[PDB]
Amino acid sequence: LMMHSQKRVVVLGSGVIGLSSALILARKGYSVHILARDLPEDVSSQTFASPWAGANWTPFMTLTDGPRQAKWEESTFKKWVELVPTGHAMWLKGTRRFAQNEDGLLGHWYKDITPNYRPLPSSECPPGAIGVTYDTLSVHAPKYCQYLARELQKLGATFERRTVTSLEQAFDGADLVVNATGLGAKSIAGIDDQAAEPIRGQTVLVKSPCKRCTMDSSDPASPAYIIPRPGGEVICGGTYGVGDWDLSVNPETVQRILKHCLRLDPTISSDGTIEGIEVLRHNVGLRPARRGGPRVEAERIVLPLDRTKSPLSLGRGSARAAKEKEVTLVHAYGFSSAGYQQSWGAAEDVAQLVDEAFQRYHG
Amino acid sequence: LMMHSQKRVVVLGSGVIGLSSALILARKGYSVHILARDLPEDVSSQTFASPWAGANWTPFMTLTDGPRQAKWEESTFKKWVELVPTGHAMWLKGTRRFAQNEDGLLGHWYKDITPNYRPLPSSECPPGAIGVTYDTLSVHAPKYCQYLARELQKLGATFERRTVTSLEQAFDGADLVVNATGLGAKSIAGIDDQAAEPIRGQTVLVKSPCKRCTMDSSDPASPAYIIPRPGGEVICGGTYGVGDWDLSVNPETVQRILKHCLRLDPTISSDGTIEGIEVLRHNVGLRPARRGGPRVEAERIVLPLDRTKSPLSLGRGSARAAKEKEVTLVHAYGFSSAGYQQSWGAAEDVAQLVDEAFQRYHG
Numbered sequence: 001l002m003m004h005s006q007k008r009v010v011v012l013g014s015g016v017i018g019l020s021s022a023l024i025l026a027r028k029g030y031s032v033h034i035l036a037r038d039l040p041e042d043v044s045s046q047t048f049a050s051p052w053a054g055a056n057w058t059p060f061m062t063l064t065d066g067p068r069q070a071k072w073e074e075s076t077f078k079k080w081v082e083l084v085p086t087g088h089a090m091w092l093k094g095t096r097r098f099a100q101n102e103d104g105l106l107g108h109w110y111k112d113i114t115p116n117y118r119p120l121p122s123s124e125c126p127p128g129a130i131g132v133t134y135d136t137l138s139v140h141a142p143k144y145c146q147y148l149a150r151e152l153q154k155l156g157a158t159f160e161r162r163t164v165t166s167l168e169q170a171f172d173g174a175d176l177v178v179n180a181t182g183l184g185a186k187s188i189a190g191i192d193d194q195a196a197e198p199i200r201g202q203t204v205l206v207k208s209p210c211k212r213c214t215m216d217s218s219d220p221a222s223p224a225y226i227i228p229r230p231g232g233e234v235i236c237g238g239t240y241g242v243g244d245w246d247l248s249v250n251p252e253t254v255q256r257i258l259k260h261c262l263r264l265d266p267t268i269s270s271d272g273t274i275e276g277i278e279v280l281r282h283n284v285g286l287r288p289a290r291r292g293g294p295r296v297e298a299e300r301i302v303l304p305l306d307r308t309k310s311p312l313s314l315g316r317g318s319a320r321a322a323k324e325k326e327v328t329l330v331h332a333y334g335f336s337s338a339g340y341q342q343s344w345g346a347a348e349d350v351a352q353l354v355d356e357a358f359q360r361y362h363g
Numbered sequence: 364l365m366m367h368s369q370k371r372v373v374v375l376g377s378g379v380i381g382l383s384s385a386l387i388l389a390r391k392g393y394s395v396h397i398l399a400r401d402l403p404e405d406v407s408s409q410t411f412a413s414p415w416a417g418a419n420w421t422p423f424m425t426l427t428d429g430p431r432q433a434k435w436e437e438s439t440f441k442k443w444v445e446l447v448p449t450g451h452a453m454w455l456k457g458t459r460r461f462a463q464n465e466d467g468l469l470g471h472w473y474k475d476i477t478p479n480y481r482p483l484p485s486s487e488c489p490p491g492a493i494g495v496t497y498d499t500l501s502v503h504a505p506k507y508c509q510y511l512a513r514e515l516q517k518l519g520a521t522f523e524r525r526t527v528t529s530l531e532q533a534f535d536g537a538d539l540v541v542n543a544t545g546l547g548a549k550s551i552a553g554i555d556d557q558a559a560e561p562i563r564g565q566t567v568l569v570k571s572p573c574k575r576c577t578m579d580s581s582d583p584a585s586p587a588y589i590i591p592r593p594g595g596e597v598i599c600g601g602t603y604g605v606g607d608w609d610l611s612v613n614p615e616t617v618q619r620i621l622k623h624c625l626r627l628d629p630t631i632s633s634d635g636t637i638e639g640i641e642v643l644r645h646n647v648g649l650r651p652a653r654r655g656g657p658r659v660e661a662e663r664i665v666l667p668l669d670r671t672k673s674p675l676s677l678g679r680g681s682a683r684a685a686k687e688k689e690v691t692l693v694h695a696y697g698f699s700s701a702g703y704q705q706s707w708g709a710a711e712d713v714a715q716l717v718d719e720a721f722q723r724y725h726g
């Protein structure tokens with residue numbers, strides 16, 4: 001007769017959001033099992049977003065438009081500062097950010113977070129653009145997820161490859177699931193979220209000692225960015241193809257991205273020419289976005305599902321029947337272009353929802 | 364000092380085409396190694412087509428439009444007949460095929476292949492449609508690939524998971540590669556085929572003892588088909604979304620497919636109603652098609668690649684340089700909606716090209 005945990009949770013999804021959420025829960029003493037199709041070793045899989053990110057910290061919203069996003073970003077910056085000594089995050093000093101106009105600088109809301117924030121002179125911007133410079137942070141996206149997974153191993157979390165088609169498959173050995181499935185949320189019966197949408201991102205991974213980050217949103221016909229990452233490499237971008245599921249490399253996009261990034265910073269090349277860029281890989285990932293913004297909230301659901309709950313329910317629609325339990329589903333998906341930079345703060349909010357649900361519903 | 368093989372080949376890709384090609388080569392005494400991202404155990408992976416097929420034998424072209432396709436189909440039918448005794452293929456007796464008009468019956472070219480071919484009376488067709496009936500064959504798509512893989516194991520072929528980005532990575536231990544990469548052919552440097560395109564197919568897998576196949580192309584607003592497969596299950600379709608990469612399940616498509624299939628055959632349900640259909644899974648796969656039709660041909664290529672051969676070449680465009688060898692690349696991709704029904708005949712043509720290349724170029 002042993003004393004077993006009364007704090008079991010399943011995390012569905014093993015991208016940066018599921019991993020971060022799992023880790024804070026494990027630290028809080030929950031017994032965590034991670035169920036996912038794609039795991040941190042899957043460093044070239046296009047069926048999840050996390051391998052493909054820069055990943056730097058670049059706020060995209062005003063406070064009024066994105067209050068949660070700012071909270072989550074501010075919290076994650078603090079965490080990444082703590083990771084610099086051990087090399088899991090890296091300073092991007094003197095990052096340059098260009099916008100079409102003052103509005104695109106988002107009210108400068110993050111100016112107390114990124115050190116050394118200040119305007120750039122027009123001489124330091126693309127023609128007709130406006131700019132600021134500051135010190136930000138980046139992580140090596142696949143290696144950061146693998147780090148989180150090692151931390152999870154030590155805290156007793158376990159992992160299992162599974163592809164779920166209906167929610168009851170996740171409510172396996174726990175009465176609370178964290179839904180961190182990115183795009184998958186649309187096609188799981190009992191979630192069925194039609195608002196989930198991809199935002200396609202093509203990049204070129206380059207070998208370069210360049211440690212300068214440049215974020216250029218001043219040309220609406222050509223998104224571009226240069227994001228150095230731990231390790232001797234730079235990610236050159238990019239695209240933001242809303243609703244585009246295409247996983248193939250566009251060769252014309254390659255040329256546009258490299259020409260534009262070269263204009264922003266010639267040192268990404270050996271000799272300043274497109275031909276001097278040492279290309280390591282051409283990449284395409286689908287950012288998991290959501291019309292109406294990221295979903296971070298707790299829902300109570302009755303199982304089994306019926307066709308009345310979900311058009312995708314399995315079995316005969318004719319059912320209604322069977323055993324019947326109520327469970328808690330804590331959503332955490334739709335982070336779009338900002339899942340890494342929001343991940344720690346989002347995870348903190350997920351863990352708070354789990355604590356509150358446990359108090360109300362789980363004894 | 365042992366006598367080693369002088370007949371090494373790599374097959375790049377492990378869908379039905381790569382597997383079939385590998386198997387005929389192994390039978391011919393080649394030493395075959397299969398390199399692929401997705402292998403036959405990956406029965407729910409959306410990054411290749413082969414898990415998702417019906418798979419039945421339904422010619423789609425006239426002889427004049429598709430001479431190779433007909434050759435390949437006729438050969439594969441003979442092979443599948445040979446597989447019926449051991450349960451790897453199944454007769455679909457009294458299959459019904461509906462078309463909008465006589466032209467859609469393709470000149471009846473296959474009437475000596477499928478037993479019991481004859482016209483249907485209009486009373487047996489959707490209103491305004493024309494029809495024929497015949498006996499055809501189907502295989503269980505994922506299990507058929509797993510069968511081929513067991514046959515390959517016995518003949519000494521080996522497998523390795525790899526995702527290739529540039530052709531030299533495949534020319535590993537062999538001077539001849541079979542390129543059976545489906546959609547992947549567009550994004551591998553040294554192949555770069557912009558004509559590769561997906562054709563998206565959504566289906567509903569249903570549990571039903573129904574053994575009747577119905578193929579309905581008489582409604583251009585609603586493709587539909589019911590394909591029984593070994594095992595107690597039927598695949599209900601479908602869609603043909605040319606150029607559509609969307610991997611998510613469309614709930615409105617579910618309703619259209621089930622309503623239309625029910626009109627064609629009520630016995631897919633327990634009680635003849637949509638609600639009586641026992642749904643096992645909702646599926647989306649991308650057929651690997653190609654503008655200009657399937658590509659089955661042998662090319663000679665110099666390695667290393669340079670930026671002049673491929674916009675996606677790795678390293679600096681500035682290169683031209685390095686060791687330099689010529690190798691043989693035998694293409695086998697772009698089979699669209701007909702890769703299973705063409706697979707054996709296509710493999711026979713691949714193996715002939717390999718024999719001829721070996722004679723001319725490989726000693």
Ligand SMILES: [C][C]([N])[C@]1([O])=O[O@@-]23[C@@]45=[C]C([C])=C([C])[C]=C426N2=[C@@]4(C(=O)[N]C(=O)N=C4N5[C][C]([O])[C]([O])[C]([O])[C]OP([O])(=O)OP([O])(=O)O[C][C]4O[C](N5[C]=NC7=C5N=[C]N=C7[N])[C]([O])[C]4[O])[O-]2136
Nearest residue numbers: 013014015038049050054056164182184201285339340341
């Ligand atoms: C500049 C920037 N920002 C940009 O560009 O944007 O972006 C990214 C992405 C991409 C694609 C790119 C190209 C880039 C990048 N970069 C970054 C940065 O820098 N930063 C940040 O922050 N971010 C970013 N990004 C974005 C990201 O990536 C995102 O957001 C994330 O990753 C997201 O995450 P999550 O949410 O976690 O998601 P994922 O990863 O996708 O994962 C999912 C999961 O789940 C699973 N599943 C699904 N479904 C299912 C499942 N399982 C089971 N069953 C079912 N059914 C999967 O598998 C996984 O695990 O930028």
Ligand SMILES: [C][C]([N])[C@]1([O])=O[O@@-]23[C@@]45=[C]C([C])=C([C])[C]=C426N2=[C@@]4(C(=O)[N]C(=O)N=C4N5[C][C]([O])[C]([O])[C]([O])[C]OP([O])(=O)OP([O])(=O)O[C][C]4O[C](N5[C]=NC7=C5N=[C]N=C7[N])[C]([O])[C]4[O])[O-]2136
Nearest residue numbers: 376377378401412413417419527545547564648702703704
């Ligand atoms: C009625 C009919 N016909 C229709 O509907 O159409 O179709 C299919 C499909 C689908 C999707 C569906 C839904 C259905 C179905 N079905 C069938 C029938 O019935 N019959 C026939 O014949 N067919 C069919 N189908 C179609 C099929 O599926 C196809 O064609 C095939 O599968 C194709 O094959 P292949 O060519 O082999 O391809 P895949 O599978 O995709 O594979 C590929 C491979 O490769 C690899 N990769 C790529 N990339 C790469 C790689 N590796 C390495 N590296 C790189 N980069 C992959 O992974 C694999 O392995 O019907």
